[PDB]
Amino acid sequence: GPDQRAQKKGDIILGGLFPIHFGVAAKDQDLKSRPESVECIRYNFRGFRWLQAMIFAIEEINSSPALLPNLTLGYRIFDTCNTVSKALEATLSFVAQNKIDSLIPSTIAVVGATGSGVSTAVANLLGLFYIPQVSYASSSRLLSNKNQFKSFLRTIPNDEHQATAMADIIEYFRWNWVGTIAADDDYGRPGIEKFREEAEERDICIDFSELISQYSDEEEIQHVVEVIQNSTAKVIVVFSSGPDLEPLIKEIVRRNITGKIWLASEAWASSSLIAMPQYFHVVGGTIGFALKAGQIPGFREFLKKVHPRKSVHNGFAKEFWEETFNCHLRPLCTGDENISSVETPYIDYTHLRISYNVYLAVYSIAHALQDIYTCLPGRGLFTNGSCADIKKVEAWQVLKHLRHLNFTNNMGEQVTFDECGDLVGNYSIINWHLSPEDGSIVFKEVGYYNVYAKKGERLFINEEKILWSGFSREVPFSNCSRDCLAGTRKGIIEGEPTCCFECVECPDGEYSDETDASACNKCPDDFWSNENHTSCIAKEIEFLSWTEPFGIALTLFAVLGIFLTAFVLGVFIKFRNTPIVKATNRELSYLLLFSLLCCFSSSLFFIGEPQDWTCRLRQPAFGISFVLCISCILVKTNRVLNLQFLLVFLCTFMQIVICVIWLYTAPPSSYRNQELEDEIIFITCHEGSLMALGFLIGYTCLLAAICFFFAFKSRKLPENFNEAKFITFSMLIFFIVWISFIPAYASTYGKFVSAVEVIAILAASFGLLACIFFNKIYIIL
Template structure:
C-alpha cells in the first residue's frame, strides 16, 4: 500500500512546481481541479467524487502531458457537496454553537480516481486553489479538518497524508474496516459504520433466510476486497458456502464483465452479494439485463442499495427484489429549498457549478477561459443563460426522499463544529493540554482539534446520538431496503427492516418478511442451496473436492437413525430400541421370550402339567397298590422316589416359561440339574438292584446283603448330593443371570438366561450325562436278565430314549432362534421325562389296573422260573 501512495504522489507532483523565495511558493501551473470555496474564520476542507471517471492523458517523453479530464457528472454526489455547504451555513446562523466564529469551506472534486484525489488532498493541505497566485508554504494547516473522502481507497491514501500532519478527517462514506486501525490512520473518523458491521449484517441476513449457497462479486479496490473477505468469513461461521467469488476491475473490461456474467449463468447459486459502487456496477448491470438473467436474488451493499441510477424500470427485470443495506436516513428541513437556489450567478467563475448547470439542462456556457473545453458536441448545444428553472427538472439532485449519505455529511460537519465548540469553551486552567492550557480558537493546531473530536458526544436535531468509539467509528445501524415495483410501473425502494449492532446479541437483525418482495415477484423466500436438505433418516456425506454445502444424502446404516434434517452423523439407538423403517426415530424393540400367554407356551405348559398329573396318578396308584407283588418286586422306595423326581422334572420345565428374572434363571438350571440327577440316580439304583438280584440267585453269591435298602437310599442321596454341590459352587461363583440378547436378531430383544459360568454349566450337564451313561451301560448288561416283568429291559429302553432325546437336543438347541431355543429345551425335558415315566411305570400300571390276575406272587415267580429255563 505504501508503494501505491508513493506512486500516485510521483504521478501528481509533475503537474506543478514551486520556486521557494522568502518562504513563499508560486504556482507555475494550475491544477485541473473543480472546487467550491468560501472564506471564513475557520476553513473546513471537503472531498467529493462529483465525476464518475477521469480521462487519462497519453504519456510520452516527447510532449508535455495534458491535464486529467473528469467526465460523467454525478448529481447525487453533487447533492452531498451541497449538503456540506448547507450544513455550514446552518451552523453559521446558529447563535449557540459557534456564535463568534464563521466557518468557511474549501471543497474539491476528486473524480473518484486516486491521482485526482491525491492532488485534491495536497491542494487542501497547502491552501492551493485555482483562483490564487501566491501561497504560503510554511506554518499551520490552512484547514481545520477534512470532510471526506467518499471511497475507502481514496480515504486510505488521504488519511495517511493527513495523519502525518495530525489533521482530522471525518468520512461520510468510507466504510473499509481497515480504516479503524488507529496506528495507520490516527486522525480518521467516520459517520458511517465500518464494513465489519455490514459484513456481519449481511451474513445474518443470509442465515435468516436459510441460504447456504451464495456467490459474491466485489470491486477490485480496498472497499470491495476488504468487505467481501469479511463477508466470506462471517458466512462460513454460519455454515454457508461460497459458490463463486468474482472481481470487477477498476478499469472497465468487457471481457471480464462477460466472464462474470457467464459465471453467474453457470452457477447453481441463486443469491449473489454485490459489493461495489454505482459507477462500477453500471457495466455489469447492463450486461446482466442484456442477457436477460432473471430470478437471481441480489444482496446489495450500502453503496448501491438505494441508487436511483440502477433502480430503474429497465433493470428491474433482472434486479427486482434486491435486498440491501443502507445508511439511516433523515428528512432535513429547508434542504430542498437550498438545492433549488443554486445558480451560476451566485458563484461566478466556479467551474463546478457551471458543469452542474450544463449537465442538468443540456446546455453550455460560452466561456472565454480554459475551464471548459469546447468540442463539436459542445458547440451544437444551446447556450446556458443561468436562469433555467431547476424545479422543472425531475432529477436525483433535487430528490431529498433518500438522504442517507447526505445525512452522514450533515453529521460529519456537525461533529467538527461540536469539536470546535468544545475547544472554544474550554475552561482556563482546566484545559487538556500542557499545564492544563486550552487551545486558542483563533489560532489552533489541527492536533488540538483532533483531541476534542475524539470526545465529541451530542444528540442532533433528529434525536440521533453522535459520537465515535476508540476506533473513530460510530454506532452501527442500517436500514434494510427492498426494490419493489410501484403501481405506476416505477421502482420504489422500501424499508423492510433494521440492523442495530447495539442491540442484544441475536436481536440485531429485525426484518418484516411480509413486506419483502423477492426476485420472483412473490413473498416466497427463494432457495439457494448446493444440495437438497438431507431428510431425517439420512446423513450428509461430503463430496470430494467440493465445499461442505455440497453433499450426498446416505441412508443410515442398520441399527442407526438421524432425527434431524441435514444430520452429519447417524447415531446408534439404545440397546432396547431399534430404528423404524424410515430410520428417523428409535422405537422400542420387540421383546421376545417364551411366555405363558403364547400359544407355544400354553401348549408346553399344558403338556408339563399333564405329565405332572399322569405321574402323580401313577404315584397314587403305586401307593395304593404298594403291597402288591408288582410294586414290591423292585424296591418300592426307589420307585416312589423316582416318581417324585419325575414330577419335579415335569415341573422344572415351567421355570423355563415366562420372562427371565434372577430367581427364575437360578431355579431353571439348578432345579433342572438336581431333578434329573435324582431321577437318573434312582434309575441307576434300580439297575444295580436288578443286577444284584440276579447275582444273588447264583450259587455262593449273596451280593444283596451289601446293597440293601439303606445302601440304595445312600447311593441315591450321594449321587444327587454331588450334583447339589456342583450347583452350589456354580451359584457361589458365577450364577445364571437374565440378559438381553441382540446378537442374533438385532431388531428383537431376546430375554434369556445367561448361564454365567460355562464351566459350571457343563459340569452340571456332564454329571447328568455321566449318570445317564452309567445307567445305560448297566441297563444294557441287564437287559436279558430274568427279572420281574422285564424290569431291566424297561430301564434299558428308558435310558436309550433319554439319551436319544438329549443327543438330538444339542443341534436343535443351537439352530433354534429366540424363544424357540427355550422351547426346544423344554421339549427335551418333557420328552425325556415322558420317556422315563412311560418305560418304567406304564407297563406296571397296565398290570395293576388292566391285568390284576398277573399281579400275583405266583405269576411273578412262575415267570421268573420260566425265564430261567
C-alpha cells in the same frame, strides 16, 4: 486547482471534495503527445446534492448569530469524479500555503471525500500538514488507523459492523453456502475480509470470492460471471460501490441470470446506477444496508432555489442545469426551467443519509471553531490550558478541538468522535421492491441493525415485508447440501468444504435420531436399531414362556402325566389287597410312582424363564428321579431273577453325590446369549461343568443298560404277567427317546432346546409308566 469549482470568500475557509461526476473518460493515455487533463463524463446528481448540503450548512451557520458570531465561513469545493488524481489536484490546491512553508487562501479543514481510496490518498497529504479532514461517506476500517492518518475523522460509521451484520443476516435465514464479490479498492477488500472472518466464525462456507472494478476488462467480467454461473450458492454478498459493480450487473443482465439473492453493502444498496427497472429481473429483491436518515429543515427549498445565474458562488450549477433539462447556455435554454419538472436524484429522494453526513461534518467543524472561539483563557486544551486565537486559528488547533468535540444535533443527538475518529450509528435494512404505480425500484425498510446492542441481539428483520427476488414470499435455499435425515449421517466429500456433505445411512445396530448427525450413535447393549435407524428399540428376550401356546401344551401334557401317575397310584392304594398288587412289590411300586411324579415335576422345571436356581435344579432333579425309578425297576427284576431298598438307595445316593459335587464346585447359571442373533437375546442356562453332565447322563444310561440286560436275560419268563418283557420295552423306549433327540440337545439353543428337553423327559416318563402299569391296569380294568 480545477477551473470548475464552488468558492465563497470568508474569514475561515473549508475545503470540499464531492463526486459531481461518477468517473472519468476511460481511455489509455497513449503518451504520444503531452497528456492533457482527463475529462469527467457522467453527471452525478446525488453528489451535487451533497455539495449543496455542504453549502447549505455553511450558509445556515453564517446566517445564525448563535454559531461563530462575527465570523464568516468560506468554502473551496472541487469535483473529485471518484478519482484519486482529481482529488489530489484539489488537495494540492488546499495545501498551497502549507507547501510554501514546507519546501491562495488557507484551508482550515476539508469535507470529503466519498470513496475510501480517494479519502486515503487525500488524507496522506492532509495529515502531512495536520489539516483536519472529516469524511461523509468513506467507511473503510483502514482509515481508522490513526498512526497512518493523523487528521482523519468520519461522520459515517465504520464498515466492520456492516460486515458483521451481513454475517448475522446470513445466519438468520439459515444459509451456509454463499458467494462474495468485492470491489478491488480500499472499500471492498477490507469489508469482504471482515465478512470472511465473521462468516468463518459462524460456520458459513464461501464458495467463491471475486474482485471487480469499473475498469475490469471483458475477460475478467466474463470470468466472474462464469464463476457465478458454475456456483450452486444463490446468496452473493457484494461489498462494492455503484460504479465498481455496474459492469458486472450489466453483464449479468445481458446473460439473464436470475434467482440470486444479493446482499448489498451501503455503498450500492441505494445506487441509481444499479437500482434500475431494466435490471430488476436480476437485482430485484436485493437486501441491503442504509444509513440512519436525518432531517435538514429547509434543505429542500434551498435545493429548489438553484439556478445558473443566481448561483454565482457555485460553479457546478451550470452543468447541473445543462444535464437536468438537456439544454445548453442540444437546444438553448432560457433559464426559466422548473426543477420540479424533471425526474432526477437531486430533488427526488426520500431520505437524507449521506447528505445528513455532509451537514454533520460541516457542523462538527463549526462547533470545533465555536469551542475555540468561546475558550476561557485558563481552561484550554493547549499548553498550560491556553486557548487559540480564533482570528489567527491554525488547522492543527481545529483538529485538536475536533478530537475532543461533543455537540448536540438539530435532532437532539450527541455527536462525538472516538480516538479512531469514528461516528457510530445504526443501520437500516432495506429490500428492493418494484413500484406498481411507477415501475421504479422502491427501497422498503424491512429491518434494522442496532449496533448499540449486545452481540446476537443487534439484528431485527420483519420477513413478512421481504419479497425474495422481488416477487417471492418463500425464503430461498442457499445450502450446499440438503440436511441428512434421521436414520442417516454425514459423510465427507473429498476436496469440498464442510458445508457440502453426502448422506449415508446408519449401519445396522446404530441409530441416528437427530437430523444432520455427524456420526451414527450406537445403541446400548440390550437395544437394537429401528428399521430406518431413526431410533432403536429394546431387544426381544427369548425363552420358553408359560403363557406361550407351545409351553401351554407342554405344561398340559406334564400335568396329564401327573394325573395318570396319581390315578395309577390311587388304584394301587385302594386295591392293594388284590393278588396282582401283592405279586409286585407294593412298596417298590409306591416308590416307582413317586419317582415318576418327581420326573414329571422335573420336566416342569425346564418350562419357564431361566433362573440360576432353575438351571441348577433342572438336570439334577430329572437325573435323581430317573435313577430312582430305574433302580426300583432293577430291584423288581432282581426279585424276578430290605435289600431292594438298599440297592435303590445306593444308586440314588451315587447320583446325588454327583449332583451335590458339581453343584458345589460349579453351579449352572442363567446367561443371556447375545451372539446367536443381533436382534434377539436368548435367555438360556449354562452347565458349568460339562463333564458333570457327562457323569449324570452316563450313570443314568449305565443303570439303564444294566436293567436292560438283566430284563433281556429273563424276558421270556412268565412271572408277574410277563413283567420282564414290559420292563425291557420301557427301557428300550427310554433309549429310543434319548437317542431320537440327540441333534437337538445342543447348538439349536433358545426355546427349542428346552422344548426338546421337556418333550424327551415326557416321552421317556410316559413310556416307562405305560410299560410298567398299563398291563396291570388292564388286568384290573
